Amino acid sequence: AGWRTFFVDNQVKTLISEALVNNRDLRMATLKVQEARAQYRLNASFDLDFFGRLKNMSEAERQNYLATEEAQRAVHILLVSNVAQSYFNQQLAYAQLQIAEETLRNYQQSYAFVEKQNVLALEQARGVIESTRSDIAKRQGELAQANNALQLLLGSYGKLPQAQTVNSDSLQSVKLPAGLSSQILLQRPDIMEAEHALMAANANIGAARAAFFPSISLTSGISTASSDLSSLFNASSGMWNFIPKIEIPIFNRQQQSVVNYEQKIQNAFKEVADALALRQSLNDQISAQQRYLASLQITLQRARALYQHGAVSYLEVLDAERSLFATRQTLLDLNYARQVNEISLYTALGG
Amino acid sequence: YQNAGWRTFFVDNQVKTLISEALVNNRDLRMATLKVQEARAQYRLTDADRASFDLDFFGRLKNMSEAERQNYLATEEAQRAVHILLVSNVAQSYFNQQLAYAQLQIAEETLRNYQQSYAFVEKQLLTGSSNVLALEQARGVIESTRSDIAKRQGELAQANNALQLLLGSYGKLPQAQTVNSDSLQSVKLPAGLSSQILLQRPDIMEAEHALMAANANIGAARAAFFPSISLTSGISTASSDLSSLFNASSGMWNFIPKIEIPIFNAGRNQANLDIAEIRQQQSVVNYEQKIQNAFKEVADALALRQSLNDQISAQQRYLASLQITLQRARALYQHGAVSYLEVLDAERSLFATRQTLLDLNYARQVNEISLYTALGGGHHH
């Protein structure tokens, strides 16, 4: 139940728990997730992999596969990650919608002010007032879609969450355990499967693990990527470094399963490393935006005062407020991309 | 004419048939007042056996003497009021009827669904698969579902009653008009709808009558006090003119009347100068207060309309996904890929969502009736 300790936000944990209760039947869960995603269009490569692989097998093969433990772990991961994803989408939409509405208000005072005092300028204000109103209906629809996804993943009773103001706080990720054992990744279903294949080619998993799976810490003394993890991918090259050493012979179908293994292993470590760097990188971006935002807030406060003393036109206050709105949106995109990356991470670690 | 208001407002043909029939059977205004009172009475039957417009109208009437009542019912605004009362009430009762037919249809579908899941949980049990409290649960929800079937059946009868009363002895009550889930939106109103339409409200007709009793220049009073804007935008939404009549997040009213021409002559002089002024002042303050309120009502109705539209649109989307998910679950069941109970659970989701959609649609219809009322009997010129 890694989900419980991985997602900080308590609402998304409520949602996940609820979805876990209602999704006893594995095949049904597969349906719900499929419809929650299909309702959008025609990353989530974990999803693409899973559905494609499932759709390329006979019905009899599917029912067998969903009995294996790796499939039940995969589906659990699919369910949890999709609920969390649906929620972030919902929260993203409430917030972009909320900013577009304040934006619409601002632009409408900006219109009325201009006319009171060019017609070229006046009609540009009619241009954005509309594309802002069309934007509003766009976000209204994304909201409906996220809501659709959430009802589906859970159950009938339409008690959805409202706009969580939980910002300036859940703007940042879970602190990862310092010294997290790379052996967490043996619980990835892709790696679990690779080892079943190893057992099929008559191999000793112990020696297979010893020879090919590096035992390291994934995180540093902080919660950042460990120096060990970085040292597995040649700088500038960005390519896997590890040389497997065969002490104990691996075997008691064959040299396919070993290369499958080395390929899954190297990629799992790569997914974790990308996730760690991106997460760290998004931290920095968000934090800078946040400091910028505060500088905009006082600028608007100060512009508000000046206007009261006749020192600037009202349009200056409106422009100061547009800047504030522009940054709040950027924050929101960045944060959202953080949450999507967190889900990548959770999935990469395998539950 | 003047049937033009409801004929061009209510988009549903069946309801337009019923309205037309009730008008024919109610040629006498006082009797229609009776039939409406009594049609409303026997909904309130649910508590004597164990709309702001109608309250205002009926309240107004009992507060007067019988001589006053007969005088009022001979005025132009009263005939207008009785027209709208009769139209709005026939519409309401029909929607009630269709609501009940619909809630009933779902409740019976639900009952069959719970019976099939009872028959499964029992076969399960005697093959050592279920809890005995599971059987208990199944039996409870069936019993309470039989209760609802009886309750909806009660409400259907209350609405049929109300309809027969408004329609008369020879009126045919409609059967269940089965609903298309993709045609649940409202009548698109004319664009640029003139505020002048509001002068046909009974309350405003009365205000102007009082104005003329105190010898106002009506033209002058209208120019001074009645905003001459458009009510609707390029579509079917509250226009910006309408919106700007109310202070943003106060609800407070922004129109400042400016009197260019005096509304009242300097009196016939010494004919109770300070008393005629009083009556003059009263009719003015009253006109102005009826106007703000007429505009507010329409604004609120247009907003409620927009909102319900969004909510319905969202339910229709949830439903389409539930429908696809059910078909897929049924096919999977046919391949042994899922339990029969999973299909029944999926069907129950479809049912709940259908009920929510019916509630929403009904609130949409009550709001149309409200709009039609607020406008003063349609949006026809």
Curated annotation (Swiss-Prot), chain A:
GO terms under biological process: copper ion export; copper ion transmembrane transport; detoxification of copper ion; intracellular copper ion homeostasis; protein homotrimerization; response to copper ion; response to silver ion; response to toxic substance
Phenotype when changing residue 140 to R: In strain: K1 / RS218
Keywords in alphabetical order: Cell outer membrane, Ion transport, Lipoprotein, Membrane, Palmitate, Porin, Signal, Transmembrane, Transmembrane beta strand, Transport
Keyword Transmembrane: yes
Protein name as it appears in the record: Cation efflux system protein CusC
InterPro entries: OMF, OMP_efflux, RND_efflux_OM_lipoprot_NodT
Oligomeric form and interacting partners: Homotrimer. Component of the cus efflux system composed of CusA, CusB, CusC and CusF.
Coiled coil: none
Induction and repression of expression: Transcriptionally regulated by CusR in response to copper and silver ions.
MF-aspect GO terms: copper ion binding; copper ion transmembrane transporter activity; diacylglycerol binding; efflux transmembrane transporter activity; identical protein binding; porin activity; transmembrane transporter activity
Subcellular location, record wording: Cell outer membrane
Misc remark: The cus system plays an important role in copper tolerance under anaerobic growth and, under extreme copper stress, in aerobic growth.
Homology family: Belongs to the outer membrane factor (OMF) (TC 1.B.17) family.
UniProt organism field: Escherichia coli (strain K12)
Superkingdom in the source lineage: Bacteria
GO cellular component assignments: cell outer membrane; membrane; pore complex
Function summary: Forms pores that allow passive diffusion of cations across the outer membrane. Part of a cation efflux system that mediates resistance to copper and silver. In pathogenic strains it allows the bacteria to invade brain microvascular endothelial cells (BMEC) thus allowing it to cross the blood-brain barrier and cause neonatal meningitis.
Membrane topology: Multi-pass membrane protein; Lipid-anchor
